Write a structure and sequence with these properties.
hydrolase; two-stranded antiparallel sheet; Beta-lactamase; alpha+beta; 265 residues
């Protein structure tokens, strides 16, 4: 039984694991702690981009955003190289997904507008999708504290899987905006050891990672089987019993994805 395999991963990795894969015409849903809250970490950056795409015409992607070194908060592998040139909204979207660029995310939040540096606008975007669960409360920062049991900055595997379903595979976005999201996630650089690692090479995988303290490791993906069937796969984990310093475990995500792959295959 698949639930036992997930429980064994929890015991072997000393982790809490959440998994949701929405049901299809041809497959049952996979759910393991799918309605328990986990920290977003950087997984929010994919729907963030969807929000920016949604609220603006595509010509908005060429708006140059200028910023300063004082805006560098969090790992920002792209943004840190363009403090004096700035970056277009398109480039920020690219960096935010493909390099989980934190500064980029923060600038995209600002681009959405409104209170909380954009976290309100982001959360309302999700509310407008039908998600009454997920919440973004803080801008990215390396100084952020987010202890277990605080419901701020959380989603559920079930919630974020259905959001991603709508965005990539549903009609949340018009096809041209949808394609930009899909493409960016298809060329993610950070996800090779997670869901991607658990799916055979002939499956297409697009994804957005998240990592944090308390051993938090997330990956949200859309996968395409060799037979052309797409599935959304949300995996979230933390190791809170290990405290702030618990090591994130990518392998747990890879192995959970392997259990999923096994059943959709």
């Amino acid at each position: 039984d698949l639930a036992d395999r997930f429980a064994e991963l929890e015991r072997r990795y000393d982790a809490r694991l959440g998994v949701y894969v929405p049901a299809t015409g041809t497959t049952a849903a996979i759910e393991y702690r799918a309605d328990e809250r986990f920290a977003f970490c950087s997984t929010f950056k994919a729907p963030l981009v969807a929000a920016v795409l949604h609220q603006n015409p595509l010509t908005h992607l060429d708006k140059l955003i200028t910023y300063t070194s004082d805006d560098i908060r969090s790992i920002s592998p792209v943004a840190q190289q363009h403090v004096q040139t700035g970056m277009t909204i398109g480039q920020l979207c690219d960096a935010a997904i493909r390099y989980s660029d934190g500064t980029a995310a923060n600038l995209l939040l600002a681009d959405l507008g409104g209170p909380g540096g954009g976290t309100a606008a982001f959360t309302g975007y999700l509310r407008s999708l039908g998600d009454t669960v997920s919440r973004l409360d803080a801008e990215e920062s390396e100084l952020n504290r987010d202890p277990p049991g605080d419901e701020r900055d959380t989603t559920t595997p079930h919630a974020i899987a259905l959001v991603l379903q709508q965005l990539v595979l549903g009609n949340a976005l018009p096809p041209d905006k949808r394609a930009l999201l899909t493409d960016w996630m298809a060329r993610n650089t950070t996800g090779a050891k997670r869901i991607r690692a658990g799916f055979p090479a002939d499956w297409k995988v697009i994804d957005k990672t998240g990592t944090g303290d308390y051993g938090r490791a997330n990956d949200i993906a859309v996968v395409w089987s060799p037979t052309g069937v797409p599935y959304v796969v949300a995996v979230m984990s933390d190791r809170a019993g290990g405290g702030y310093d618990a090591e994130p475990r990518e392998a747990l995500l890879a192995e959970a994805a392997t259990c999923v792959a096994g059943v959709l295959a």
